[PDB]
Design an enzyme around this catalytic site. Structure first.
Site, PDB file in Angstrom:
ATOM      1  N   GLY A 254      26.704  -4.541  96.614  1.00 46.24           N
ATOM      2  CA  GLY A 254      27.340  -3.739  95.618  1.00 46.24           C
ATOM      3  C   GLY A 254      28.294  -4.562  94.794  1.00 46.24           C
ATOM      4  O   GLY A 254      28.181  -4.598  93.597  1.00 46.24           O
ATOM      5  N   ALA A 255      29.251  -5.229  95.447  1.00 46.55           N
ATOM      6  CA  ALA A 255      30.315  -6.010  94.796  1.00 46.55           C
ATOM      7  C   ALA A 255      31.062  -6.919  95.792  1.00 46.55           C
ATOM      8  O   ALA A 255      30.935  -6.759  96.998  1.00 46.55           O
ATOM      9  CB  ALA A 255      31.303  -5.092  94.140  1.00 46.55           C
ATOM     10  N   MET A 256      31.864  -7.843  95.277  1.00 49.03           N
ATOM     11  CA  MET A 256      32.402  -8.963  96.054  1.00 49.03           C
ATOM     12  C   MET A 256      33.784  -9.293  95.651  1.00 49.03           C
ATOM     13  O   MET A 256      34.054  -9.594  94.463  1.00 49.03           O
ATOM     14  CB  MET A 256      31.514 -10.187  95.863  1.00 49.03           C
ATOM     15  CG  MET A 256      32.008 -11.379  96.659  1.00 49.03           C
ATOM     16  SD  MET A 256      32.128 -10.981  98.598  1.00 49.03           S
ATOM     17  CE  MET A 256      33.759 -11.999  99.043  1.00 49.03           C
ATOM     18  N   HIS A 290      37.767  -0.351  95.913  1.00 50.93           N
ATOM     19  CA  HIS A 290      37.416  -1.132  97.103  1.00 50.93           C
ATOM     20  C   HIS A 290      37.667  -2.613  96.936  1.00 50.93           C
ATOM     21  O   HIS A 290      38.438  -3.214  97.713  1.00 50.93           O
ATOM     22  CB  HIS A 290      35.921  -0.890  97.457  1.00 50.93           C
ATOM     23  CG  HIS A 290      35.468  -1.544  98.717  1.00 50.93           C
ATOM     24  ND1 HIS A 290      35.382  -0.880  99.912  1.00 50.93           N
ATOM     25  CD2 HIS A 290      35.068  -2.809  98.966  1.00 50.93           C
ATOM     26  CE1 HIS A 290      34.906  -1.693 100.835  1.00 50.93           C
ATOM     27  NE2 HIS A 290      34.685  -2.861 100.273  1.00 50.93           N
ATOM     28  N   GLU A 291      37.031  -3.217  95.931  1.00 50.27           N
ATOM     29  CA  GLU A 291      37.155  -4.649  95.752  1.00 50.27           C
ATOM     30  C   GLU A 291      38.598  -5.058  95.417  1.00 50.27           C
ATOM     31  O   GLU A 291      39.031  -6.160  95.815  1.00 50.27           O
ATOM     32  CB  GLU A 291      36.258  -5.202  94.679  1.00 50.27           C
ATOM     33  CG  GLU A 291      34.766  -4.911  94.823  1.00 50.27           C
ATOM     34  CD  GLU A 291      34.152  -5.157  96.206  1.00 50.27           C
ATOM     35  OE1 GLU A 291      34.461  -6.116  96.960  1.00 50.27           O
ATOM     36  OE2 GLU A 291      33.292  -4.340  96.529  1.00 50.27           O
ATOM     37  N   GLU A 313      36.469  -4.470 106.383  1.00 47.17           N
ATOM     38  CA  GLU A 313      35.603  -3.500 105.703  1.00 47.17           C
ATOM     39  C   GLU A 313      35.906  -2.057 106.102  1.00 47.17           C
ATOM     40  O   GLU A 313      35.928  -1.161 105.257  1.00 47.17           O
ATOM     41  CB  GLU A 313      34.089  -3.805 105.859  1.00 47.17           C
ATOM     42  CG  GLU A 313      33.660  -5.170 105.301  1.00 47.17           C
ATOM     43  CD  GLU A 313      33.995  -5.353 103.819  1.00 47.17           C
ATOM     44  OE1 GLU A 313      34.285  -4.319 103.084  1.00 47.17           O
ATOM     45  OE2 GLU A 313      33.959  -6.533 103.379  1.00 47.17           O
TER      46      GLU A 313
HETATM   47  C1  LIG Z   1      28.631  -9.216 101.303  1.00 50.15           C
HETATM   48  C2  LIG Z   1      29.723  -8.943 100.263  1.00 50.15           C
HETATM   49  C3  LIG Z   1      29.135  -9.361  98.862  1.00 50.15           C
HETATM   50  C4  LIG Z   1      30.144  -7.464 100.120  1.00 50.15           C
HETATM   51  C5  LIG Z   1      31.436  -7.047 100.787  1.00 50.15           C
HETATM   52  N1  LIG Z   1      32.593  -7.969 100.915  1.00 50.15           N
HETATM   53  P1  LIG Z   1      32.019  -5.392  99.985  1.00 50.15           P
HETATM   54  O1  LIG Z   1      33.347  -5.619  99.400  1.00 50.15           O
HETATM   55  O2  LIG Z   1      30.836  -5.077  99.135  1.00 50.15           O
HETATM   56  O3  LIG Z   1      32.103  -4.766 101.307  1.00 50.15           O
HETATM   57 ZN   LIG Z   2      34.197  -4.777 101.076  1.00 46.29          ZN
END
Ligand SMILES: CC(C)C[C@@H](N)P(=O)(O)O
Ligand SMILES: [Zn+2]
Length: 864
Positions: A254-256, A290-291, A313
């Site tokens: 989804g995101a990083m 979240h991010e 997480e």
């Molecule tokens: C594996 C990585 C790209 C995703 C997580 N750090 P989240 O922030 O999407 O949980």
């Molecule tokens: Zn995450």
């Protein structure tokens, strides 16, 4: 090689400074590193992870004696105090289809390093308890790559005569290698800012394609909300004067959260009302949140090892959930979270791949980015909140950061801080991290004298990692209602209240709620107070009561879920006997009261009209024929659709009228649309011919994507040729919009029509489909894989198709393949004819030469 938590040992070496230099050319990019290394265990060999092509290595400027074996580089003789290592590597980013490491996408270059991608860029100590200060220099052709980014502050740059230019980024916060990012490309920028509570401006920059730029405004606003909220709710403030976000169309997740330079799948960054659903808009808000939340819960404090993944997480998902609930529709959004947990996490915990929130072992860590670690993770965090109240929870957070800012820590550490900050013992609470499986509560209630006596039992089943399961700390929130449904007070632990949290810590306990002077029905596990199955012997009448009158959203919803569940069970019986369907007379009575109650929140009403999925209905069963569960479910929906057809039109019309042409995203408007889309689905079940009407005014109905998606979803199973014409028109209108094309593919892949397999096989060759694109692949194939009648076709076609695609994707993207192969997780619980076919397909996957570790690990769990 299996990695075990019990073998953790600290690193022999620390890396203090990491200086990187990137020289981007066609086709190759050359990486020269300079590492400052600090021996912790003097005399040990220096061991570096790496898989990129190695051109040179040096210790203090001189060619090093070393050996390369597999993915490790080893230098035996190394200084007994501070030294440098310089590694030179070469990468071909256009050849990288795994989308881990440095890779190309749409003519530009991006990185994805969590968890072990950095070692695909350079040789390094690529583990999260090794934290270093990075400075990154980048050189590239200016015209092809005008935009050159990495973490932190840009402190220098220039031009060269030959057309190249360079930049230099310094990130002053020590970090583990998984948080490194680089972007290089021709990208449009959207600029903004937020001023932190102590008066510092933070420049915000979102980077997208020139064409995608107008769809990024809602992401920007969501970020500014998220920054504000982290200050007001947690007292957390941002720590640089720049925050950058970059959209990319080829992305596995989804995101990083890379520090100051988050990289986002376009689908959690781009929206407008014409091309995105309200749900797409809500996803953007949670994911941007979240991010950003990771900056503290993950970046400022990171993980000692990957077994601790949920420390970041679970806590960050809890954070994003709290952010969204605080913005709007808290109770509705809580239910949505629960339903997701029960529909996807529970089957995990009941299946071959079940694992603890903190695994004790893993072969490939990319297999553990799971619903258990994330969503069950958030539930565990949430239970601390439940036991301690908000204020006590924030005290834990404060002490967590006081103790651990700048460290790589464990789930034990987090527990200790919630425990120490509030002077309470949470030893028993640790089992939520180490014991897998869904606890089952068996409950009895007796009103004798004036006490309501509530007896409660817990077992936790064996899972494949562990047979022994000791009793857990399980909060159960409870109320009581009288025959008229109003709250009833009782005495518990001194106080006289209308609600309490009963703290089950043993295999069996009785709880005495004294002072009851009415006949009462208890409401249990309010707010879904713990992630468990509860059985209580409720009459239908008891459920009807709870539904009509209970004050807690979850418990009311669970009661409807329970009636639906009982009705499906009744359907399975008759169809199995070959007799008429049951009359579900009480259910229909209850649905009617929901349909007609105009004092119900619109979105909540919509959830009350949702029927549990086939995976929920076969929970705990053996010898499953999924089609028979599917036919039972379908029968219920057809009964609900036909029985209430004209009330479905009226609800629709009330909802249209309430929407009031407010086509832009807002929680208020979205609620009406959610309900309108539930009616459209029922109407087109009862009266498929209404599609021709729908088509006649499609233009007029298609005022936003929420409406087009909801109409297209409602007809997607219709055997009319018109269903196909409308999909084809949708493809044509939105052919330039890649995120909308993902919708088209999802519709192709999910259809209940009889011809879906061949339509899917045609879609594979559609000019906008790329198997090498994770969004696409998930959209078509992932959807097909979840399409019950088609994936579980008796002839095996569905299993053979999916197994071929697992084989094919795994040759370039093991991550996507290992997620896909999990469609077979039900294997050992199927009836014998499908089980045989599943086992054959898994054997064929196993037999492939060169099968990834990712997929092998999963097939092992299912097969062996
Ligand atoms: C594996 C990585 C790209 C995703 C997580 N750090 P989240 O922030 O999407 O949980
Ligand atoms: Zn995450």
């Amino acid at each position: 090689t299996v990695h075990y938590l019990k073998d953790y040992q600290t690193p022999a070496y620390h890396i203090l400074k990491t200086d990187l230099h990137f020289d981007i050319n066609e086709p190759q990019t050359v990486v020269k590193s300079r590492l400052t290394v600090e021996p912790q265990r003097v005399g040990e060999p220096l061991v570096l992870d790496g898989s990129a092509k190695l051109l040179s290595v040096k210790i203090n400027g001189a060619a090093a004696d070393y050996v390369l074996e597999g993915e490790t580089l080893t230098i035996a003789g190394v200084p007994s105090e501070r030294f440098t290592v310089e590694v030179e590597t070469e990468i071909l980013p256009a050849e990288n289809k795994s989308l881990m490491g440095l890779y190309a996408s749409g003519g530009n270059l991006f990185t994805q390093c969590e968890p072990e991608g950095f070692r695909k860029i350079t040789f390094y100590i690529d583990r999260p308890d090794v934290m270093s200060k990075f400075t990154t220099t980048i050189v590239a052709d200016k015209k092809r790559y005008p935009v050159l980014l990495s973490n932190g502050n840009k402190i220098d740059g220039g031009e060269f005569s030959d057309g190249r230019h360079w930049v230099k980024w310094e990130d002053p916060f020590s970090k583990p290698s998984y948080l490194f990012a680089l972007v290089a490309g021709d990208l449009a920028v959207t600029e903004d800012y937020f001023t932190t509570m102590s008066g510092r401006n933070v420049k915000i920059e979102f980077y997208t394609t020139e064409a995608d730029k107008p769809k990024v405004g809602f992401a920007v606003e969501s970020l500014k909300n998220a920054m504000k909220w982290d200050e007001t709710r947690f007292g957390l403030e941002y720590d640089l004067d720049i925050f950058m976000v970059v959209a990319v169309g080829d992305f596995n997740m989804g995101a990083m959260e890379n520090k100051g330079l988050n990289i986002f799948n376009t689908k959690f960054v781009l929206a407008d009302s014409r091309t995105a659903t309200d749900t797409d808009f809500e996803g953007i808000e949670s994911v941007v949140g979240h991010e950003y939340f990771h900056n503290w819960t993950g970046n400022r404090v990171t993980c000692r090892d990957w077994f601790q993944l949920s420390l970041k997480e679970g806590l960050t998902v809890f954070r994003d959930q709290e952010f969204s609930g605080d913005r709007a529709s808290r109770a509705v959004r809580r239910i949505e979270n629960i339903r997701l947990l029960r529909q996807h996490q529970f089957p995990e915990d009941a299946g071959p791949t079940a694992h603890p929130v903190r695994p004790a072992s893993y072969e490939e860590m990319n297999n553990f980015y799971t619903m258990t670690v994330y969503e069950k993770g958030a539930e565990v965090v949430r239970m601390y909140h439940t036991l301690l109240g908000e204020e006590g929870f924030q005290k834990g957070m404060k002490l967590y950061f006081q103790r651990h800012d700048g460290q790589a820590v464990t789930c034990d550490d987090f527990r200790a801080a919630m425990a120490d900050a509030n002077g309470i013992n949470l030893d028993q609470f640790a089992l939520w991290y180490s014991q897998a499986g869904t606890p089952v509560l068996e409950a009895e209630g007796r009103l004798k004298n004036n006490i309501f006596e509530l007896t409660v039992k817990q077992t936790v089943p064996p899972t494949p990692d562990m047979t022994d399961k000791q009793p857990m700390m399980i909060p159960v929130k409870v109320g009581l209602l009288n025959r008229n449904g109003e709250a009833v007070a009782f005495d518990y632990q001194g106080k006289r209240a209308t609600e309490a949290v009963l703290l089950l810590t043993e295999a069996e306990q009785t709880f005495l709620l004294e002072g009851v002077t009415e006949a009462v029905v208890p409401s249990l596990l309010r707010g879904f107070s713990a992630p468990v199955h509860l059985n209580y012997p409720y009459s239908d009448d008891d459920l009807l009561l709870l539904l009509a009158h209970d004050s807690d959203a979850f418990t009311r919803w669970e009661a409807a879920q329970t009636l639906y569940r009982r009705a499906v069970a009744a359907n399975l019986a008759t169809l199995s006997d070959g007799v008429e369907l049951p009359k579900h007379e009480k259910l229909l009575a209850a649905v009617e009261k929901v349909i007609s109650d105009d004092l119900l929140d619109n979105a909540f009403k919509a959830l009350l009209l949702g029927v549990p999925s086939e995976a929920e209905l076969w929970d705990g069963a053996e010898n499953i024929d999924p089609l028979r569960y599917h036919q039972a479910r379908e029968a219920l929906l057809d009964t609900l659709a036909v029985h209430f057809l004209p009330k479905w039109h009226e609800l629709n019309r009330q909802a249209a009228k309430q929407e009031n042409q407010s086509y832009e995203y807002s929680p208020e408007a979205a609620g009406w649309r959610t309900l309108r889309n539930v009616c459209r689905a029922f109407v087109l079940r009862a009266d498929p011919a209404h599609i021709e009407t729908v088509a006649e005014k499609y233009g007029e109905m298609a005022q936003n994507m929420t409406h087009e998606w909801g109409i297209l979803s409602a007809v997607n199973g219709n055997e009319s040729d018109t269903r196909n014409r409308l999909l084809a028109q949708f493809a044509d209108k939105f052919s330039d919009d890649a995120l909308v094309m993902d919708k088209y593919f999802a519709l192709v892949g999910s259809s209940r029509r009889s011809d879906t397999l061949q339509q899917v096989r045609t879609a594979l060759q559609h000019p906008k489909f790329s198997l090498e694109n994770p969004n696409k692949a998930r959209s078509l194939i992932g959807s097909f894989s979840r399409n019950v009648p088609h994936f579980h076709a008796e002839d095996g076609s569905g299993y053979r198709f999916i197994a071929d695609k697992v084989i094919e994707i795994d040759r370039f993207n093991p991550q996507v393949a290992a997620r896909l192969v999990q469609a077979f997780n039900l294997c050992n619980k199927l009836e014998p004819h499908r089980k045989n076919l599943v086992k054959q397909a898994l054997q064929r996957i196993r037999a492939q030469e060169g099968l990834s570790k990712d997929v092998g690990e999963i097939v092992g769990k299912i097969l062996d």
